[PDB]
Amino acid sequence: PSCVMDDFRDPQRWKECAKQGKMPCYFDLIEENVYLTEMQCECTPLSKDERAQGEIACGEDCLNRLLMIECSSRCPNGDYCSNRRFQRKQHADVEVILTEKKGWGLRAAKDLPSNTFVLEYCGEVLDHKEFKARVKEYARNKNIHYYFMALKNDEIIDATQKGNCSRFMNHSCEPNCETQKWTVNGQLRVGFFTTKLVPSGSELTFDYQFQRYGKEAQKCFCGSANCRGYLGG
Ligand SMILES: Nc1ncnc2c1ncn2[C@@H]1O[C@H](CSCC[C@H](N)C(=O)O)[C@@H](O)[C@H]1O
Ligand SMILES: [Cl-]
Ligand SMILES: [Zn+2]
Ligand SMILES: [Zn+2]
Ligand SMILES: [Zn+2]
């Protein structure tokens, strides 16, 4: 069984689909981080002609891009700016699929070039105390899957109760994706980016080590030749 990201925007169809196992269990779908406890680059504006020809606005040499800072609405290239991906939700084409042993996962629905933005990892942002309170509550609940992603000092993103389809990305010891932390309006965010060409139909994975927390070690079913046997601890 598989589904498209848009299926998750229809609550009643989702809830019926999940009742039949055609979709993952319900979560609260969100498109920006929620905090539980509450500048222009120097790129030359491209001409209309340069845009027509396919030239890229705020590409590899953009001073903002070079520091993993996204441009604002005030970018010299305005609408043309290609360095506003988190903000404009310029996601890769991906599907949510049921795996054999890992629960649900994500797979490329088209060929994805190397270094393609996949999705932002959204959820509830927690401080250390809230995080520890959540770990104990989830253990008490006998939860199987964990969704704690390190963001910064004293900031953890928890996608357990609220998030988007990024929360379905499974671990691999030999992954095809990586996290990258990007500054958007002075605020840090976390997103997934391919590290190689990902052929259509392949599962999208990243290495959880040092960035995902899980209270119990879980046996790894990644299947790589170099599998380390476990994720979390
Ligand atoms: N390589 C792997 N081997 C075994 N379980 C994995 C895995 N990668 C992810 N998981 C499972 O998924 C959790 C991370 S959340 C990833 C989405 C999850 N598969 C889901 O169905 O909602 C882990 O805590 C573990 O329970
Ligand atoms: Cl599996
Ligand atoms: Zn620029
Ligand atoms: Zn720009
Ligand atoms: Zn593994």
What CATH number is given to the structural domain containing 102?
A: 2.170.270.10
Residue type, 24: P
> Buried b vs exposed e over 184-206: b needs ≥16 C-beta within 10 Å?
beeeebbbbbbeeebeeeebbbb
How many structural domains compose the chain?
1
DSSP string across 109-176: SS-B-TT-EEEE---EEE-HHHHHHHHHHHHHTT-----EEEEETTEEEE-SSEE-GGGGPEE-SS-S
Q: In terms of Cα–Cα distance, which of 31, 14, 18, 35 is closest to 158?
A: 35
At 191, is the secondary structure helix, strand, or coil? strand
Helix (H, G, I), strand (E, B) or coil at 200: coil
Technique of determination:
X-ray
Sheet with 2-4, edge to edge strand ranges: 2-4, 94-98, 104-108
Resolution (A): 2.1
- Decide if 170 contacts 99 (C-beta within 8 A): yes
Return contacts of 3-12, CB within 8 angstroms, 24+ apart: 3/95, 3/96, 3/97, 4/95, 4/96, 4/109, 5/91, 5/94, 5/95, 5/96, 5/165, 7/96, 8/96, 8/164, 8/165
Annotated binding site: 41, 43, 58, 62, 71, 75, 81, 102-104, 145-147, 170-171, 173, 218, 220-222, 227
Helix/strand/coil for 67: helix
Residues that constitute the known binding site for Zn(2+): 41, 43, 58, 62, 71, 75, 81, 173, 220, 222, 227
What are the residues whose beta carbons fall under 8 Å from the beta carbon of 9, sequence distance 6 or more?
29
Q: Amino acid identity, residue 38?
A: E
Name 193's Cβ contacts closer than 8 Å, sequence gap at least 6.
115, 116, 117, 118, 177, 178, 179, 180
For 151, other C-beta atoms within 10 Å of its C-beta total 19
Chain breaks in the chain (C to N over 2.5 A) after: 38
Q: Quick one: CA dihedral 231, 162, 108, 100, positive or negative?
A: positive
Ligand 1 atom closest to the Cα of residue 172 is 1
| 226: helix, strand or coil | coil
- Determine whether 166 is exposed, middle or buried from the number of CB atoms within 10 Å of its CB (0-12, 13-18, 19+): buried
Q: Which domain holds residue 91?
A: 1-233
